[PDB]
Amino acid sequence: QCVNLTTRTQLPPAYTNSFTRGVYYPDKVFRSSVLHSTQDLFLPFFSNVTWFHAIHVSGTNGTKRFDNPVLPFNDGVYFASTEKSNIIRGWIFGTTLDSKTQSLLIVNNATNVVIKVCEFQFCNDPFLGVYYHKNNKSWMESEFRVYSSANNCTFEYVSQPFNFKNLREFVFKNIDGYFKIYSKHTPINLVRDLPQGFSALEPLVDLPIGINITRFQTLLALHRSYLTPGDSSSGWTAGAAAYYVGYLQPRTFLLKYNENGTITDAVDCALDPLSETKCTLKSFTVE
């Protein structure tokens, strides 16, 4: 049972620049002191990435502003989130996000992650509902509150769970019937923007889902310190968490491989003529 959290349909989203982000290891082979050109669905450098702010707005403005819209899935998506206290918990992928078609539910409680692809009738605004108490000063159990019915399940998988301080990055891609997740976790300290630096994502898992994926919706966990059984959707607060979504595109990259096998730099071969000439000349310095 879910009671609609917000009446406001949408707010005008504002975008930031994804400077040199979202680079993932293309293959599982080791290379040292090697400049390597690889074609895949990479995220374009210096792209436009939608910035979502699920935070409590000031009391003068309307009491609710947190947003979890159903966003398109276009040949894979890039997802990041700068947060503390694990506000973001899981995502939901599927075509219609309703009962007639199958959809992928990937939700992660701090101790564990559940990945089920089953026909799900979803709530408009799904949220994991945590509660907190004042006398004990401890945080308590949660309520799932994400789907009304689950039927014809075909795959279950359970594994170890996968200012601002935490910067988590994920890349989702569905190719040839498999759903692949690339991840990276990095402590950071710039509060409101994507860091200016290079980070390489590592292959977490690839799944044999075989489902059509057209749209995805993020799952946020909400906290209220009082519970009554007959009245809900009143008193929920989003804390302070921000997530970012970008879209992948078929592009060619040239990668710098370090002595210890890490990816330290990469070049977008379609940014400008200078980047193209670097990509063709296989050198990061052009004379």
Place this chain on the structure above:
Amino acid sequence: SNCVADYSVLYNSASFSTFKCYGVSPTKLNDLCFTNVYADSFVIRGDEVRQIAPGQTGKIADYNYKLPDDFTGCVIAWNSNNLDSKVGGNYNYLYRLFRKSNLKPFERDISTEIYQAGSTPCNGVEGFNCYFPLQSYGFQPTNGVGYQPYRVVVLSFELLHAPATVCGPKKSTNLVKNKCVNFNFNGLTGTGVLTES
């Protein structure tokens, strides 16, 4: 995963009418090592056994089960008229006959929505010019060779790119270093000298 794939145990109690291997030679299966091995099983008609192959057309390959063009694997099929047919008919095996678009490789569609073939929605009442998507095979013991049920198992894997856990029945030996030897590491053959790294 995590098992030796010695197929000699299938020699006494199994007889396959079509074994085809794509991306690998059938004589080399005893020396390799396979990673990310998957076993896909279903039951189809005799005339549709040809449709489980890359780049084929037909109802099965269009609406039911599509194979990638770059497929590393083997396809195995055998007649099952002695187990998958009843005298009155076997209406437990279903197939999809109508769909709006062809399937992408290795996709599965389990929806049972009514397909509108006319120019007027029927609102899921199964009226005129709108039919139920699924039909049932009629398998009888007195039907023709091409109308008998066939079991098809397709095995998908990759070779010599990632860590593997299946391997074949070949027995390993000791490690000799600083000498010129032939080596077979997880199916990868070659010649050279091995040193600590």
Place this chain on the structure above:
Amino acid sequence: SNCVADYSVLYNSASFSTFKCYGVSPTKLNDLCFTNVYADSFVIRGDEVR
């Protein structure tokens, strides 16, 4: 001549044991347009289909 070649109508009432196409792909047969189309029909033995 002068007809749409929608072979999806053959899916319900026909089952072919051997479909082989020379010079054209079965997956591309639904997108092209054919010139000078003729249909030859005859009946032979099982071993003579090859």
Place this chain on the structure above:
Amino acid sequence: EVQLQQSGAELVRPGALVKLSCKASGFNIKDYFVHWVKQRPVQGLEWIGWIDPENGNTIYGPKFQGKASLAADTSSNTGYLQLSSLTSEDTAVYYCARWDGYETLDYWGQGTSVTVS
């Protein structure tokens, strides 16, 4: 033991607001929630609602939703209730209560009784 200190009996004119004070000892109002209560021998006792000192907001009941306001300040261990203007319905006994999260009301003061000329 927890005990509460409450406004004494009041005799007032109609057509004007009224203010009440509910006091606590042994804890901070932030630690709990605060309910208010008005009681009538005939027509029974009524339930007003809860105010959260930590939130800075308050959720009221619907019968009292009109003509009621709740305020709190942590500086003193005191919570306050006020009404827009005194009607015959408001000429009643009044109580304040403390409500634990995920729980019942646990503390009730001596009370306050409003009589009108």
Place this chain on the structure above:
Amino acid sequence: DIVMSQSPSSLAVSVGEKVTMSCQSSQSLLYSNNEKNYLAWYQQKPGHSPKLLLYWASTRESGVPDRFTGSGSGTAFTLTISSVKAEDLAVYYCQQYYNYPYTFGGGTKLEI
């Protein structure tokens, strides 16, 4: 909103007699997620501020041991005394905690 009814209105029994009071509700009190019944029981004397008795049917709290024993259902709720005691002149109420407002019953009185 939830409405509460109580019975008996008033009953007179001697000290040591068994007495039972029952109050009935028009809606269910059970909450599936916790499987917990959100109901309490109160006892009050004239001119004494109402004080909570232990909720969730676990009526046992500090005081004289097992003063009053209670039983409840999804829609029905009863309180029992195995032996009436002279000191415990009491008036009782039934309240619910399922939705706003927390209902107050019609009241029950016990006389000796």
Place this chain on the structure above:
Amino acid sequence: NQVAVLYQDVNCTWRVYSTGSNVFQTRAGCLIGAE
């Protein structure tokens, strides 16, 4: 990292990646990005 781009088949008096400022026409093409 500043660059100038020479489009040798376009006549600036368009089929260019960007127009920016300081567009100069030459008989060898249109030079965009140089003064």
